[PDB]
Amino acid sequence: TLEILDITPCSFGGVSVITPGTNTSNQVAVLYQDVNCTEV
Amino acid sequence: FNKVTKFNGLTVLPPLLTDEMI
Numbered sequence: 761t762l763e764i765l766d767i768t769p770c771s772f773g774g775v776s777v778i779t780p781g782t783n784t785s786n787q788v789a790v791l792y793q794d795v796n797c798t799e800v
Numbered sequence: 801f802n803k804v805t806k807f808n809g810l811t812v813l814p815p816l817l818t819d820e821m822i
C-alpha cells in the first residue's frame with residue numbers, strides 16, 4: 761500500500777547519574793538525556 | 801533571534817541556561 765513512512769533514530773541519549781556526594785547518600789537520581797519517559 | 805538560526809551518537813546538549821534565563 762503506497763504511503764509515506766518516516767523513520768527516526770531509536771532513542772539514545774546518555775544516562776547521567778546525579779548524586780549528592782557519597783559523603784551524604786547512596787541515593788542517586790538518574791537522568792536519561794533527551795528521551796520521552798516511556799522507553800525506560 | 802530572527803537572524804541567527806539526533807542521528808549518529810551525535811547529540812546536542814541543552815545549554816544549562818535557557819534564553820528566558822539569559
Ligand SMILES: *[C@@H]1O[C@H](CO)[C@@H](O)[C@H](O)[C@H]1NC(C)=O
Nearest residue numbers: 779780781782783784785786
Ligand atoms: C563530608 O563528610 C565528612 C566526614 O566524612 C565531613 O568532615 C564533612 O564536613 C562533610 N562535608 C560537608 C560538605 O558537609
Ligand SMILES: *[C@@H]1O[C@H](CO)[C@@H](O)[C@H](O)[C@H]1NC(C)=O
Nearest residue numbers: 771793794795796797798799
Ligand atoms: C512524549 O510522549 C507522549 C506520548 O507518546 C506525547 O504525548 C508527548 O508529546 C511526548 N513528548 C515528547 C517531548 O516527546
